[PDB]
Amino acid sequence: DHSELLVNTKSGKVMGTRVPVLSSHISAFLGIPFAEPPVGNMRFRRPEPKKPWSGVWNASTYPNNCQQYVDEQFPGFSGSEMWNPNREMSEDCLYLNIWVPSPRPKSTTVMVWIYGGGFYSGSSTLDVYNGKYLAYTEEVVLVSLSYRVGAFGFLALHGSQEAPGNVGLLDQRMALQWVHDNIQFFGGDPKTVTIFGESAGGASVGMHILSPGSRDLFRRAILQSGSPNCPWASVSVAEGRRRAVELGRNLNCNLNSDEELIHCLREKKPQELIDVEWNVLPFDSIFRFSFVPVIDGEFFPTSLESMLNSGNFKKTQILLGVNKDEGSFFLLYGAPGFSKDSESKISREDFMSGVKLSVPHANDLGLDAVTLQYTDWMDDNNGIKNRDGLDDIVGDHNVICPLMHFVNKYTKFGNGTYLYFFNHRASNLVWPEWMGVIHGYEIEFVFGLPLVKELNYTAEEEALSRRIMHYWATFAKTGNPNEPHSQESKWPLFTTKEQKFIDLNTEPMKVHQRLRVQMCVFWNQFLPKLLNAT
Amino acid sequence: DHSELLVNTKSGKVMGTRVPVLSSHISAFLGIPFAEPPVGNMRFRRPEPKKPWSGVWNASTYPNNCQQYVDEQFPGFSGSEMWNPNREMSEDCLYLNIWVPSPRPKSTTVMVWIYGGGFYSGSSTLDVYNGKYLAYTEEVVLVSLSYRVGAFGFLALHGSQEAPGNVGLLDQRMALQWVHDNIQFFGGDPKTVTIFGESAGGASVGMHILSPGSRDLFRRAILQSGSPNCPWASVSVAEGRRRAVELGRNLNCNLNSDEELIHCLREKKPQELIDVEWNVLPFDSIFRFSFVPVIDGEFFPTSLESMLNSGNFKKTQILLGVNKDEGSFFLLYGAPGFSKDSESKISREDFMSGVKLSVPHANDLGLDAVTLQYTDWMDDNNGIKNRDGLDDIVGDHNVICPLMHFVNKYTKFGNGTYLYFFNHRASNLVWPEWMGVIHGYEIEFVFGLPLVKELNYTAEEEALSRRIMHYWATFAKTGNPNEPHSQESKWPLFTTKEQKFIDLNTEPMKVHQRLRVQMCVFWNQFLPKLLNAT
């Protein structure tokens, strides 16, 4: 050995950089490769481990971000820009980042972050994912991995070994394998690794809990506004095939064989695939993405529901929850009547249009059922009630109720469940008020941005961030978010019987029960029975 | 002429009796025949007008009551006994009663009461129907008619002229014809006749509004907790036929022809028919009666819904409304878990049983829809919530929502609609508290029983009765319950747009809108669409 910033791993030596953090410093090892570049003939293929290298790998700067659709709806607006790639895009994008406390610990709790982005976008390098605050404040080794998204990570032609599907999930698994095998050299304890992620990242976490091939690579899990059984998080192999073929058709490919199709798709430049990616969806919809995980019978042995029902999944502790207004982000971008600069009061006709877009797979009776369930017939033309009702429909159907179904099924076999409901609207949010507590906006509290004065949060928002970070890190470390022997209010364990959860905000803790049961019994029990019968 | 108690009608002379009323007196002509006794070979047949008679008809005492099932669930209990026949039963039961103010008026407003009893029971002679208080207090000529009930009034073998069906409705029409032709001799104005009735009596009123053969015989109408489109108020000719045949089977009749069946049924004593009447229902249900009106294409030209939709009905003014807890009476008598002497807190299993009994015609998905709509999933084992939820289900499905559908359809073509919601629980009610404001218990306020000291009502209950009687009588007289130029609170007209209604109780008037819209959109729009699709 020789330096705090020099670490020798089983793949080779790596040189980090010292980084300033809240008046102190820590080490950062950025852009460490964990797989061979998935380029050329390797596009769509399972990832291959990175060949060890001679010399010192320079890990002082962020890596490229994977090829992805870029949001240009509000050019320059920080609200949407904060999610876009902040590094050059490239198919050579399989890297991970590690923030290590200083002095380098010996065997401390490890947290691995899996970014979201609907499986079609996302980056490990975003300012909101800067792991130095959490690593520094809670003294954990914080890792953020990356994985292929869009067609590159999820194009699926089941049966072929050239584009089997789920390779983006396999990229994540390879990074977890690299962490298992090498994090000890950075002072992390590979026996105490917690994977956590948001939205598609949270669904990913749940997928690794389910997939037998991933279970052994981590200890505990945290899922933020995402669940493996979300209606948008996976497709059948038949639907995946249908979309891969349709993509081919959009690029004038030869469709006579998987081989012809894949070869053609492999000759296209990245942007050519991204330019027609949205043309393959089966319905006019919102909260539906083209290339996502496939129930292949390999990564996922059987249907997610049967795995959940039989307990065919990793049994450990989990901490998860949702935000109050999960649907607003999606309505703003794709439902008629909504806009960034107006209060977006929704007419009755636009409500109807929104319902249709929100539950694309529903027949007319189904649409009537949804509409009835969310319409106040004493005040049906209330623009605000219609706007908020759509917000709830999108959020309940796509995030909350799927998570609540997962929570209840998991808890029957698990070793500990902690549930939260994040409902604090940040004081400095740039999005309009009508959007409320937006999908993805608890992340900045989990990563400690509020402790940064220049970001302009309130003192109570800093207090909230510290509490959340300490809950997350204590759970990662012990399997319980609560400090043993503490005097603070206790976050109750969610049990099959009591189903307790806590609100997460700047007010004194408050415990509740049966998070949105009324609506979720409709989404998880009644509606699917209706659609299957009719 | 010679006496105040002697009246010469087109059918013959009638001698009434002077009756004491609140320290004063009025004339009463009881038991006047309006049809030929429907006995022997006339059983099941349309009624025939009463042959005029020589001499003076003695109208000093009540007539017999029609043959009917007698309630023996609570022997001697006044709560149920007050509805039972208080006179000897006989098939010779087609009579009417008239209360005439003294001095005999010249041409005053007439009100004709049509009793309820689920089309299988009822009497014009009940203490709660004593018309002297209303006749005296509001100075109206009050008439109460009678009509055949049960198999005697509604056995239906469409196609045959011996038992065509609807003859009980024809009995009512004949009495309205007699009133049209003769009430002028009692000082009533045949141009200003208001028909009013409760439950089956209210459905009857709506049926005369619909039936072209009855329309010309009255001016205005009042419907209390009953509507012609109620799910229990009529059956198809096929279902009527099926039940007539099943009755025959219960009595070991020859079923080879309508003639064989009818002849056999005609030889049976009345009680033999009554003893097996309940064995013909198609489902295990509550709020369903065996022999009721049939959509025959004669009394009712087409389906009730198409008549309502096209405006094929008498256009005039109507005053109608419902009671708060329409379902309790029915649950007490036929749903498991309910009893007269306990609070009847309902278990979850009994709720399920109740739902099934309440919507007999629903498939499983339908039952799930109902259950979901009325279950508080944050507190599903609340015995009181389950009990009250069943109360609402039975009331909304059988009375309230059908009436609200009728109200909205009628109002599009009518000349004035006044709607009420009676929610006062009488201080001296003998039924338990859990039953609330019971089906049929606004009648005593409409007939003025509270003005009778010995009956023990409160002073405010007397005030309520007087207000209601004056609303009813002023509406009968003018087509508007409000006193022109009065200073009292005004009962707003129900309009297609505003849908206003008033509560009827001892508190100061309060106007509301869209009486139970949420539940009624479920019962009138969603559920039937669900059942028809699935």
Ligand SMILES: COc1ccc2c3c1O[C@H]1C[C@@H](O)C=C[C@@]31CCN(CCCN1CCCCC1)C2
């Ligand atoms: C399934 O959930 C999502 C689907 C798509 C996206 C996100 C997301 O969750 C968010 C927070 C985080 O996970 C990253 C990106 C997300 C916000 C940024 N948009 C950028 C494109 C515009 N986008 C369209 C979908 C609705 C949000 C706005 C991509």
Ligand SMILES: COc1ccc2c3c1O[C@H]1C[C@@H](O)C=C[C@@]31CCN(CCCN1CCCCC1)C2
């Ligand atoms: C369709 O509405 C009803 C069906 C049946 C009955 C009545 C009724 O409404 C009531 C008030 C009035 O219209 C007369 C009788 C009614 C109360 C007395 N019961 C006596 C038998 C027991 N009965 C069974 C049915 C539920 C009420 C109690 C008969």
Ligand SMILES: *[C@@H]1O[C@H](CO)[C@@H](O[C@@H]2O[C@H](CO)[C@@H](O)[C@H](O)[C@H]2NC(C)=O)[C@H](O)[C@H]1NC(C)=O
């Ligand atoms: C998590 O699992 C552990 C066991 O692996 C549970 O602890 C055991 O609980 C049983 C029954 O309460 C005791 O008989 C054992 O002695 C305990 N063993 C240990 C090592 O503690 C624990 O209760 C589980 N927690 C949850 C929430 O399911």
Ligand SMILES: *[C@@H]1O[C@H](CO)[C@@H](O[C@@H]2O[C@H](CO)[C@@H](O)[C@H](O)[C@H]2NC(C)=O)[C@H](O)[C@H]1NC(C)=O
């Ligand atoms: C009930 O019907 C009468 C007509 O038969 C309505 O009164 C007429 O209203 C129109 C339009 O408002 C006037 O032009 C006529 O001069 C009125 N005629 C009479 C005799 O008043 C009355 O408005 C109707 N009421 C309701 C509630 O529909």
Ligand SMILES: *[C@@H]1O[C@H](CO)[C@@H](O)[C@H](O)[C@H]1NC(C)=O
């Ligand atoms: C590491 O590589 C980056 C590439 O731009 C550079 O900024 C940094 O100075 C390099 N340091 C060393 C020791 O090569």
Ligand SMILES: *[C@@H]1O[C@H](CO)[C@@H](O)[C@H](O)[C@H]1NC(C)=O
């Ligand atoms: C009328 O008939 C009834 C029958 O019981 C009787 O009570 C009454 O006294 C009779 N009056 C006359 C004048 O016949």
